[PDB]
Design a protein around this ligand. Structure first.
Ligand code: MG
Ligand code: MG
Lengths: 98, 98
């Protein structure tokens, strides 16, 4: 499903403002399912508590809505499990310096 | 602290759109501290997951910002503990019919 690869590439352009890294390499994407006309993503945030405006979740929704055949995007934001820097990818660790 | 009573009265005018009851009688307010120039409230939502726009949390922030002497309102939205109808007040149960 090349659509899935397309989805990841799109998400890799969405950045967390506090850490300056994309949501994929930060390890914020917990699940991703793309089955036209629907796209589903389960993700978390880098800090606890629901913000008044989930700008990151909105950016992810907008990114996935660009997928061909996708007319509805469900973005589920959860804290289960809770995120920590241990979820950073190998690439992210290179970009950081680690 | 009459300011505290003022705060509760203000919150009793903020309604959850899905249930048609105010946040206080629904049992959504977990903690409330009013110490000028700051107001703090910890609350939850009636359904899981962080919404893209936390309109309820915003309404609570706007309501408390009307308190005299209060210049900053911190609204913490959590799911710990998770909410259920068991947290409804006695009054809410009368209003419902129970
Ligand atoms: Mg972890
Ligand atoms: Mg309960």
């Amino acid at each position: 499903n090349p659509l899935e690869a397309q989805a990841w590439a799109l998400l890799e352009a969405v950045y967390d403002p506090e850490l300056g890294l994309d949501v994929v390499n930060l390890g914020l994407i917990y699940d991703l399912v793309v089955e036209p006309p629907r796209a589903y993503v389960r993700m978390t945030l880098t800090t606890p508590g629901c913000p008044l405006h989930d700008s990151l979740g909105e950016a992810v929704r907008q990114a996935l809505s660009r997928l061909p055949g996708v007319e509805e995007v469900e973005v589920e934001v959860t804290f289960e499990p809770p995120w920590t820097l241990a979820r950073l990818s190998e690439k992210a660790r290179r970009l950081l310096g680690w």
